[PDB]
Ligand binder design. Structure first.
Ligand SMILES: N[C@@H](CCC(=O)N[C@@H](CSCc1ccc([N+](=O)[O-])cc1)C(=O)NCC(=O)O)C(=O)O
Ligand code: NA
Ligand code: NA
Ligand code: NA
Length: 222
């Protein structure tokens, strides 16, 4: 039957996103590393997997996929356990709530948090480009407003879609993980329900496993 293949280094946020869901359902998989220093993601071979020249790409037999959230939902459906139901697709209103807060991550939370990761981590280390502190300052003020909403939401439920962990919650892991390595990692402590939610996510065996393969400078970067 052959395990599925993920193309891209495990440290890349959107690769890690897929690996988390693979681990949640206990599926075998192969991580195919790629050399960004020779721009392997822009090679003719990889463009045939992801025509926009990005990672992850994904292969299951003759099926090629890209876009991390699409890959992840395919994994969750293919390996649907019964022991794990992260999409709630058998329940219309639960699936809707999972969908809402998955979209919130994609279009409200991650656009506020991701720039801080880029400016404080990716740009200086990976690209040799210094931190633009005005982008950081503007993004932090937006993130704080987002976190005020999350704090209220997570005061009523343990997770974002209700009293169950879901696709919505776990999609928050890869970029927030790296945020915890920036100078702004203490931010969450001002939002106690958000911090507790985050710690529940970090306690998950699948999350523990993948975060160990991403390895920051050292865990919660000081
Ligand atoms: N929507 C897509 C986004 C995928 C994506 O952005 N992949 C990035 C790597 S993860 C995000 C990321 C970007 C940059 C760094 N960095 O260190 O400079 C780290 C992580 C990529 O391949 N970029 C190459 C390109 O677009 O040309 C998905 O979720 O799959
Ligand atoms: Na990019
Ligand atoms: Na599911
Ligand atoms: Na918004």
């Amino acid at each position: 039957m052959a395990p599925v293949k993920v193309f891209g280094p495990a440290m890349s946020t959107n690769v890690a996103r897929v690996l988390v869901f693979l681990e949640e359902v206990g599926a075998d998989y192969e991580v195919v590393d790629m050399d960004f220093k020779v721009m392997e993601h822009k090679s003719p071979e990889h463009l045939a997997r992801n025509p926009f020249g990005q990672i992850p790409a994904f292969q299951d037999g003759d099926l090629l996929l890209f876009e991390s959230r699409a890959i992840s939902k395919y994994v969750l459906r293919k390996y649907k356990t019964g022991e794990v139901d992260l999409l709630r697709e058998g329940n219309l209103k639960e699936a809707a709530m999972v969908d809402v807060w998955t979209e919130v991550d994609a279009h409200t939370y991650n656009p506020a948090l991701s720039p801080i990761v880029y400016q404080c981590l990716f740009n200086p280390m990976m690209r040799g480009i210094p931190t633009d502190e005005k982008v950081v300052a503007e993004s932090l003020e937006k993130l704080k407003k987002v976190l005020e909403v999350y704090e209220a939401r997570l005061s009523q439920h343990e997770y974002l879609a209700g009293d169950f962990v879901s696709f919505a919650d776990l999609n928050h892991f890869p970029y927030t993980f790296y945020f915890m390595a920036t100078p702004h990692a203490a931010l969450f402590g001002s939002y106690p329900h958000v911090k507790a939610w985050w710690e529940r996510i970090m306690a998950r065996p699948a999350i523990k496993k993948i975060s160990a393969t991403m390895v920051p400078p050292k865990a919660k970067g000081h």
